[PDB]
Design a protein around this ligand. Structure first.
Ligand code: PCW
Ligand code: PCW
Ligand code: PCW
Ligand code: PCW
Ligand code: PCW
Ligand code: PCW
Ligand code: PCW
Ligand code: PCW
Ligand code: CLR
Ligand code: CLR
Ligand code: CLR
Ligand code: 6ZP
Ligand code: ZK1
Ligand code: ZK1
Ligand code: ZK1
Ligand code: NA
Lengths: 273, 140, 343, 134, 49, 126
């Protein structure tokens, strides 16, 4: 009769300790499969991060006119998506990236993307290469006496590193931000806290045994087995006769600062809902 | 955040709580030695003292590996006193080698009672120095 | 491609055939430079590019001796060892002072070693305060060994190779991987007269390092990447770097961004009637996506490189446990020799 | 010694030939020689313990050289096998080729030789406990 | 930055001030475009993106 | 200064590899180092057996067989081809659908030739 209770408790812990290790190996594997976005083909396949452009301009007209396979797929997703993925202002599209926790990507030019990356708050980053290739130029009125010496000045500043020196000055030197696969201490920190807390608790008990060993019936157990049996009749007697067992909500979220509206909030019991 | 240095300060609050208990028990046993007693205060003290070194000897090898050179530095004056009381002044004994071999020579009583309040003054400052740099490395 | 001689002042190559009348247009990878703009007429760039980094594509990266420690970080393993002595002293202090013993400091280092290795024990603590030390060190052991196995099962399931270099800032911050350009050309000339912060650091390295980091031919530089097992990074143009990455074998890889910005232009002689409509033709082919579509075809759709079955653990992965084992056998035979002499 | 691929009958040595694993097996070379030395020391100090039994310690000290030899096989055989698999891994993975390494009857004879000199190590120490109690 | 209104066939912005004589040059983030190259002269790109 | 003969030492070390060992325990320091580094040996090996078996059974569970043409267009490790002539090869040549243009791009440039000459030849290659 003592070896059945010792036997079914041994089978209990064989399932639980094998369930702790196997669920931890399922967490650490899925957390290792996570590939962040580093291309447009990663956005075209993963239809769980929403992405959009500005409501007007050259970026929205790029995907509308494109006949490349990965870019036709991105325009097909963006033209039919609820709600609208197209923001109206550049400051609105950076705002949606910063408040969607990583579920929204924004398609903008490469020089604002490297600039907003270097401005507080340091929330955003630039991933992947450029989708197209264009350029910024110095323009002249098509009949000027000045367009040819300006043309030879840009190609001289580019080869003297001045266009690279001035870009580092205004994007990075006047920037506001900066610039292991193994299990860290921060994940298992709380098992060192209970270890240190379990050693200090046990040296406290070593005092109040030593003070109890050095210094030194039916009346106590009659008193103690009555007040625990009354409160056993109490605390279960209140609990089964009340209706505060299951706080349940069935609300819905909004993608507007996570606006929360409950619709089926409730508190239940074994006999009242 | 929790780090390896911040664990080496958590692990020495718990052991310096025993080091002050080595000294509260060290001031009472000499106070009860003057009221009465030799051969019992031979043995009861002689068991205590070697645990007091190697727990502090742990701290010298624990803050060495934690790269805490100021905290290793403040334990250096208690360390090199502890090597002198065992390598050069051992109070021979022919046994566990501390304050047993002769007791009532009346000059070592004055030296132990100055030591018994010098240990408690060091350990009670060590308890709050370790508690500060615990909370320092956890917050920083 | 075209260069004005320092003595005869005669252009050669494709620039020399447009200046000297032997050609009418140069639809070619011809770099828009200052000294060529003064003698011929370029269009807007049909391809933008720069200097990039070619490293060898990373591999399985063979183990060391202490590779078995790697499922837990080295900060944890030091916290395990010092908590091992940390619970052995507290086992000693609790079981000696206020006893119930059998738990001296040599039996408290053996209970805690038997508890961590999950080998059970021979003796167990009998006091309350000794069973809280033993009972919490058992729970500590249960989380660490279950997270050693689970983090090891994550590593062997998902192969995830990382490159040591992801920027040219990172090549400047190391001397392990030796980097070098071609012996002459525009990439050789770029790092010489650069003044930014980093390409001056990268030039003082390359001009002095022995052996010569400068190869003579691009095919010599690609072979020196493939035959230096990840120690040679060749600095070259980002159009050959994206094409050699797509040839056979799949041994090379492009990392980081570009280092400068330059372009390839379609050239005409200075004063030609083609200079205006070709200039408007490149901007038609850019905005219709024709130049992008022609780039996907010749670099990627005609690329020989395109774009499982977990293998048994080799002995190389766990070889350092056999070294510590035999090294712990010979260290145990020394202690018996000193035990026989001391007694 | 080569066969069946550029089948040259010339057995080249390891120093007058130049594959990176052929330099990696040089790292695991001294341990089968430290093994062969300690078996020879353990054997010549075992026959002395048979022809002069008045000093019994000749048998037990020769038992240690039987066992320190076998520990030099295990480190030698781990070093030999681990140097193979490291150079089987540092190669260009191509699915149009194959590789195949095997072991032969010289690798087996060094493996069975571990079993017989740890058996000679046990039997020498039990022989010392028969002499010392007599 | 510059765009042609399809009704009026007129330019507004910085391309408007270069075609209609108000400006002599525009050092600006101005994209080299097909519909802009016909009416004004860009230099080589000082910034690729 | 036995209980530790060679047949009780082959039973302590067998009970320590299987992590099952109730028996005598070593008492000498020289006997507790060999008992200690063998316990650390088996903690790494048994954790390497379970973790490599969990890596096999997971990768063997990730295996998705082909059940579409988009699965062939993505997985460029199974080669695929049509007959050298006929309506099937001319289907992909003329197609402007995205997944079928990708399949013709792979088949037109592949070494060796994925196009068989006879239906009985293509079933033979499968
Ligand atoms: C049952 C229990 C089993 C027991 C197993 C024990 C195994 C070893 C235990 C501890 C090893 C201590 C690790 C030292 C690091 C301390 C952390 C720190 O932040 O300090 C940093 C410095 C410098 O770090 P590093 O990168 O140059 O070291 C690596 C050398 N690399 C990279 C060139 C190969 O480390 C220093 O040495 C500063 C001083 C710290 C420690 C010095 C020596 C330790 C003293 C006695 C132990 C003997 C060691 C074994 C021989
Ligand atoms: C307490 C009860 C028994 C406990 C067992 C102790 C007995 C002996 C155990 C171990 C020592 C012998 C085996 C280790 C030999 C060191 C080999 C080595 O390579 O050493 C460098 C180490 C690790 O290098 P790695 O292979 O991981 O690099 C990887 C490079 N990749 C990836 C490019 C391949 O780096 C370092 O931290 C250096 C510090 C490592 C300490 C080992 C050095 C050996 C010390 C003395 C030699 C003889 C031992 C007795 C006297
Ligand atoms: C006898 C075994 C020798 C261990 C090998 C020596 C450690 C070196 C391992 C591989 C060579 C690579 C060296 C470079 C890695 C870091 C440098 C270092 O300094 O390398 C020692 C560290 C100390 O830690 P750290 O990262 O804070 O150093 C701070 C270093 N910084 C700032 C870079 C994080 O790592 C360690 O000692 C890790 C080893 C901890 C000792 C436990 C060995 C296994 C015991 C398991 C439990 C049994 C006891 C309980 C029963
Ligand atoms: C990273 C590597 C560095 C790690 C730190 C190394 C330094 C070690 C520092 C501290 C830990 C050791 C000592 C802790 C202080 C308390 C013990 C003590 O010291 O109180 C005096 C002991 C008493 O002995 P007892 O059992 O007869 O009394 C009880 C007999 N009853 C109950 C049967 C009646 O006497 C003795 O010192 C016996 C001497 C034997 C133990 C001290 C030496 C331990 C050194 C390293 C341990 C490493 C673990 C394995 C790796
Ligand atoms: C993440 C955190 C959790 C994970 C950590 C897991 C471990 C948790 C840490 C500690 C738990 C310890 C396990 C409980 C067993 C220890 C109790 C024990 O065996 O201590 C032994 C002492 C001495 O035994 P003795 O022969 O001198 O007594 C009879 C005297 N004679 C024979 C003369 C008649 O016995 C005594 O002090 C009797 C008084 C003990 C009172 C304290 C125990 C609490 C009592 C009821 C609450 C239920 C606890 C559930 C948790
Ligand atoms: C706690 C419970 C533990 C109990 C577990 C017991 C399991 C076994 C225990 C220990 C095994 C270690 C000893 C194994 C020796 C390594 C052999 C090796 O790894 O290399 C294999 C060699 C070479 O193979 P091959 O090229 O000649 O044939 C190829 C055939 N083809 C051409 C048709 C493809 O084998 C050969 O044939 C060489 C010529 C034959 C001589 C070696 C055969 C030894 C067999 C048994 C004696 C070992 C002890 C008793 C078991
Ligand atoms: C398949 C691959 C894995 C296996 C490979 C085999 C390699 C074996 C390596 C090392 C082990 C040495 C073999 C053991 C026999 C030699 C000792 C001997 O023979 O005398 C001694 C034994 C008495 O032992 P004990 O009283 O100390 O027990 C302990 C009980 N306590 C503590 C109460 C006194 O006497 C006896 O049992 C009589 C001997 C029993 C007869 C069968 C055992 C094998 C004996 C000789 C063949 C050698 C095998 C080589 C291959
Ligand atoms: C990768 C890493 C692998 C991890 C796994 C391997 C780790 C190996 C761990 C093993 C656990 C035990 C380690 C204990 C180390 C320190 C404690 C010590 O070694 O204690 C040993 C002695 C033995 O105890 P015993 O003679 O009373 O019983 C003897 C019983 N019979 C007569 C039957 C023989 O304790 C005494 O004798 C006390 C009096 C002797 C004077 C001081 C002892 C010096 C010992 C070590 C040097 C300390 C360094 C710092 C100074
Ligand atoms: C027994 C005593 C004297 C030794 C040290 C006490 C330790 C174990 C206790 C003291 C109170 C606890 C704190 C709990 C709250 C915070 C916040 C947590 O995010 C991390 C740790 C931290 C900063 C503390 C860590 C230490 C802690 C777990
Ligand atoms: C670490 C290696 C390289 C050398 C140090 C090992 C030797 C010299 C040390 C470390 C362990 C020490 C032990 C001290 C106490 C015991 C108890 C005694 O009854 C005999 C010897 C014995 C079992 C040990 C002798 C060896 C000892 C003095
Ligand atoms: C000194 C006493 C304790 C015995 C030492 C055991 C000896 C025989 C063993 C055990 C561990 C071994 C080392 C393990 C790691 C390296 C790396 C390997 O690539 C070659 C051999 C080398 C350099 C060592 C050779 C010697 C070796 C030291
Ligand atoms: N493979 C393997 C292996 C086998 C037994 C014990 C440890 C490892 C191991 C684990 C890890 C690791 C790392 C991070 C997270 C989880 N695991 C790494 N390595 C390893 C492999 C190659 C080179 C260096 C280390 C390893 O060799
Ligand atoms: O020549 C043009 N150059 C442009 C340059 C930039 C900038 F990045 F600021 F340099 C921008 N922005 C993009 C990000 O939000 C802020 C404004 C728009 C430009 N536009 C209009 P678009 O390209 O149609 O959107 C042009 O026409
Ligand atoms: O106008 C130029 N266009 C160039 C175009 C290319 C190519 F990438 F093949 F398109 C190359 N190569 C780069 C790698 O080595 C092989 C050829 C060199 C060019 N050069 C000479 P560089 O610029 O002095 O080095 C020019 O002058
Ligand atoms: O009208 C047509 N009907 C066809 C019917 C079949 C069949 F499947 F046997 F019914 C086949 N085969 C396909 C498989 O290999 C054996 C012959 C070819 C046909 N073709 C020529 P295809 O379609 O150009 O290849 C026709 O023209
Ligand atoms: Na898994």
């Amino acid at each position: 009769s003592g070896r059945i209770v010792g036997g079914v408790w041994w089978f209990f812990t064989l399932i639980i300790i094998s369930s702790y290790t196997a669920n931890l190996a399922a967490f650490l594997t899925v957390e290792r499969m996570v590939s962040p976005i580093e291309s447009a083909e990663d956005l075209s396949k993963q239809t769980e991060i929403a992405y959009g452009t500005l409501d007007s301009g050259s970026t929205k007209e790029f995907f509308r006119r494109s006949k490349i396979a990965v870019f036709d797929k991105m325009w097909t997703y963006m033209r039919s998506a609820e709600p609208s993925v197209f923001v109206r202002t550049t400051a609105e599209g950076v705002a949606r990236v910063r408040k969607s926790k990583g579920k929204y990507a924004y398609l903008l030019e490469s020089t604002m993307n490297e600039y907003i990356e270097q401005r507080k708050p340091c929330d955003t980053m630039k991933v992947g290469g450029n989708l197209d290739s264009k350029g910024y130029g110095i323009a002249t009125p098509k009949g000027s006496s000045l367009g040819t010496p300006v043309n030879l000045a840009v190609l001289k500043l580019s080869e003297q590193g001045v266009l690279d020196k001035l870009k580092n000055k205004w994007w990075y030197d006047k920037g506001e931000c900066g610039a292991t696969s193994a299990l860290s201490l921060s994940n298992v920190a709380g098992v060192f806290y209970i270890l240190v807390g379990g050693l200090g608790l046990a040296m406290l008990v070593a005092l109040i045994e030593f003070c109890y060993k050095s210094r030194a019936g039916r009346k106590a157990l009659t008193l103690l087995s009555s007040v625990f049996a009354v409160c056993g009749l109490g605390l279960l007697g209140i609990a089964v006769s009340t209706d505060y067992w299951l706080y349940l909500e069935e609300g819905i979220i909004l993608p507007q600062n996570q606006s929360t509206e409950v619709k089926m909030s409730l508190h239940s019991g074994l006999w009242r809902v | 955040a929790f780090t390896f240095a911040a664990f080496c300060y958590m692990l020495t609050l718990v052991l310096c709580a025993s080091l002050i208990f080595f000294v509260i028990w060290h001031i009472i046993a000499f106070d009860e030695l003057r009221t009465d007693n030799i051969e019992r205060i031979c043995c009861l003290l002689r068991k205590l003292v070697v645990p007091e070194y190697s727990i502090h000897g742990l701290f010298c090898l624990m803050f060495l590996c934690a790269a805490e050179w100021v905290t290793l530095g403040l334990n250096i004056p208690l360390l090199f006193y502890h090597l002198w009381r065992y390598f050069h002044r051992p109070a021979d004994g022919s046994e566990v080698m501390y304050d047993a071999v002769s007791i009532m020579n009346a000059d070592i009583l004055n030296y132990c009672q100055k030591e018994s309040w010098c240990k408690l003054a060091f350990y009670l400052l060590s308890f709050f120095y370790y508690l500060y740099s615990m909370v320092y490395t956890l917050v920083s | 491609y075209g260069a004005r001689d320092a003595d005869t002042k005669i252009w050669n190559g494709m620039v020399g055939e447009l200046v000297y009348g032997k050609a009418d247009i140069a639809i070619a990878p011809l770099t828009i430079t200052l000294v060529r703009e003064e003698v011929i007429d370029f269009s807007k760039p049909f391809m933008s590019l720069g200097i990039s980094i070619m490293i060898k594509k990373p591999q399985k990266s063979k183990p060391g001796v202490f590779s078995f420690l790697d499922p837990l970080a080295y900060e944890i393993w030091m916290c395990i060892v010092f908590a091992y002595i940390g619970v052995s002293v507290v086992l000693f202090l609790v079981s000696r002072f206020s006893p119930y013993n059998e738990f001296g400091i040599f039996n408290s280092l053996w209970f805690s070693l038997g508890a961590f290795m999950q080998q059970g024990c021979d003796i167990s603590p009998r006091s309350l305060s000794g069973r809280i030390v033993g009972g919490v060190w058992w729970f500590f052991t249960l989380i660490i060994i279950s997270s050693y196995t689970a983090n090891l099962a994550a590593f062997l399931t998902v192969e995830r190779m990382v490159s040591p270099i992801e920027s040219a800032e990172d090549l400047s911050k190391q001397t392990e991987i030796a980097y070098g350009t071609l012996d002459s050309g525009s990439t050789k000339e770029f790092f010489r007269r650069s003044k930014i912060a980093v390409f001056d650091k990268m030039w003082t390295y390359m001009r002095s390092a022995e052996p010569s980091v400068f190869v003579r031919t691009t095919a010599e530089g690609v072979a020196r990447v493939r035959k230096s097992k990840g120690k040679y990074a060749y600095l070259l143009e980002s159009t050959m770097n994206e094409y050699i990455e797509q040839r056979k074998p799949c041994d090379t890889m492009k990392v980081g961004g570009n280092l400068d910005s330059k372009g390839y232009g379609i050239a005409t002689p200075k004063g030609s009637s083609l200079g205006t409509p070709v200039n408007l033709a490149v901007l038609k082919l850019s905005e219709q996506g024709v130049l992008d579509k022609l780039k996907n075809k010749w670099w990627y759709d005609k690329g020989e490189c395109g774009a499982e079955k977990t293998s048994a653990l080799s002995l190389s992965n766990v070889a350092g446990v056999f070294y510590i084992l035999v090294g712990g056998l010979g260290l145990a035979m020394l202690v018996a020799l000193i035990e026989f002499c001391y007694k | 010694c080569f066969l069946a691929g550029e089948e040259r009958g010339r057995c080249f040595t390891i120093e007058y030939v130049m594959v990176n694993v052929l330099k990696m097996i040089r790292s695991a070379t001294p341990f089968p020689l430290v093994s062969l030395f300690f078996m020879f020391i353990g054997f010549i100090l075992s026959n002395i313990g048979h022809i002069r039994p008045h000093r019994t310690i000749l048998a037990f000290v020769s038992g240690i050289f039987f066992i320190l030899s076998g520990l030099s096989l295990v480190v030698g055989l781990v070093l030999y096998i681990s140097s193979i698999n490291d150079e089987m891994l540092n190669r260009t993975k191509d699915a149009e080729t194959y590789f195949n390494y095997k072991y032969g009857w010289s690798f087996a004879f060094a493996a069975i030789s571990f079993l017989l000199t740890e058996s000679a190590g046990v039997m020498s120490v039990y022989l010392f406990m028969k002499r010392y109690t007599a």
